[PDB]
Nucleic acid binder design. Structure first.
Length: 49
DNA sequence: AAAAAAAAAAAAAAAAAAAAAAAAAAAAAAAAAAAACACGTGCCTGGAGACTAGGGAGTAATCCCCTTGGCGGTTAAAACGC
C-alpha cells in the first residue's frame, strides 16, 4: 500500500494498476497529469501563458 | 438515594480507432565435438614349389553266383454290394 500511494503520487495513469480514489468520484490528478496534456503546465502554462 | 444497562446523537473512515516500438515464443539452419565397420600397416605362420617313392586305384581276364524270366495250382487276398 505504501508503494501504491507512492505510485499514485507519481503516476495515476498506469494501466494494470488500481486507480486512486478521490472524494468526489474522480481519479487523482498526479504530477504527470499536471505536466503532460494540452492544458498542462508545459503546453497550457509555459507554452501558452 | 446510588449503580448498571440500553437507546440515540456525534465523530472518524473507505468507497474509441490507429500506428510505431519492444518483448517473446516456435522454428530452423549452420557449425563444432564423441562413436565405428573397414581401411592402412607390419609381422609371421601358413601357403606354395620341387623331388622322391610308394602304395592305392585303374585296367585286363574269368566265373559263378546271383539275379531275372516264364508256367502252372489252389487260393487267401482283394473287390463288390447291402
Amino acid at each position: 500500500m505504501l508503494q501504491f500511494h507512492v505510485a499514485t503520487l507519481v503516476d495515476n495513469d498506469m494501466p494494470g494498476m488500481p486507480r486512486a480514489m478521490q472524494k468526489s468520484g474522480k481519479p487523482l490528478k498526479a504530477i504527470k497529469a499536471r505536466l503532460k496534456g494540452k492544458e498542462g503546465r508545459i503546453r497550457g502554462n509555459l507554452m501558452g501563458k
